[PDB]
Design a binder for this molecule. Structure first.
Ligand SMILES: Nc1nc2c(ncn2[C@@H]2O[C@H](COP(=O)(O)O)[C@@H](O)[C@H]2O)c(=O)[nH]1
Ligand SMILES: Nc1nc2c(ncn2[C@@H]2O[C@H](COP(=O)(O)O)[C@@H](O)[C@H]2O)c(=O)[nH]1
Length: 190
């Protein structure tokens, strides 16, 4: 691997695409963790052979994880953590055991407060249009490097909404680096 994609999701937006059934994210008002994805040559490394998920290894982080890494789609958080470990976390296990991997995600979330970085510049979420350049610029100014924005288009209205924000890190998992990929157009709703 040569880097990490620390992916945070905006719960309400993610759930807005679930036009049927329940979705706990419809009631959250802060960015939460989707995953910490090891990267290599511009691609996400997935399903690397590794240790099976073991909840006991992160028993000391259950408060932080239930708060910062809840499943916004369903009510089983541990299942979500297990899936993220098996599909992504195992790919960085050569240097980060399970305990250190989840602790890394927790620390990253606590040190990358997206709303806190936007609020002062009148860029916080208000259901209205935002500029891709403006949002990335505010985050760059606050954190020092460009984030990767992720948008999704409503199949009905074709309106584009910001759904995730990626913070790119070097292989050391602490040094931020510029992201180089956005799935957002020049403008979107946030
Ligand atoms: N922002 C933030 N809140 C946390 C974190 N860990 C726990 N919390 C929250 O802070 C309060 C105290 O958590 P505790 O210190 O008992 O683990 C709870 O309301 C809990 O949801 C964390 O790492 N960051
Ligand atoms: N994006 C996302 N997927 C979730 C969440 N809770 C559970 N999941 C499950 O995790 C899968 C995501 O896999 P990933 O894209 O991280 O490899 C989804 O297909 C879904 O079944 C959540 O809050 N966000």
């Amino acid at each position: 691997m040569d880097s990490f994609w620390f992916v945070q999701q905006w719960p309400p937006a993610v759930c807005s695409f679930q036009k049927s059934g329940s979705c706990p994210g419809s009631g959250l008002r802060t960015f939460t963790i989707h995953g910490l994805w090891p990267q290599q040559s511009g691609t996400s490394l997935t399903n690397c052979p590794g240790s099976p998920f073991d909840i006991t290894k992160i028993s000391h982080l259950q408060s932080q994880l239930n708060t910062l890494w809840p499943s916004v789609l369903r009510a089983n958080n541990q299942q979500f953590w297990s899936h993220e470990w098996t599909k992504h976390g195992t790919c960085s296990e050569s240097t980060f055991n399970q305990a250190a991997y989840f602790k890394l995600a927790v620390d990253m979330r606590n040190n990358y407060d997206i709303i806190g970085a936007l609020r002062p510049h009148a860029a916080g979420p208000n259901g209205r249009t935002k500029s891709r350049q403006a949002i990335k610029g505010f985050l760059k100014a606050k954190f020092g490097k460009f984030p990767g924005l992720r948008c999704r288009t409503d199949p009905q209205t074709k309106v584009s909404y910001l759904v995730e924000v990626v913070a790119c890190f070097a292989q050391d998992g602490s040094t931020l680096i510029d992201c180089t990929r956005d799935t957002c157009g020049a403008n979107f709703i946030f």
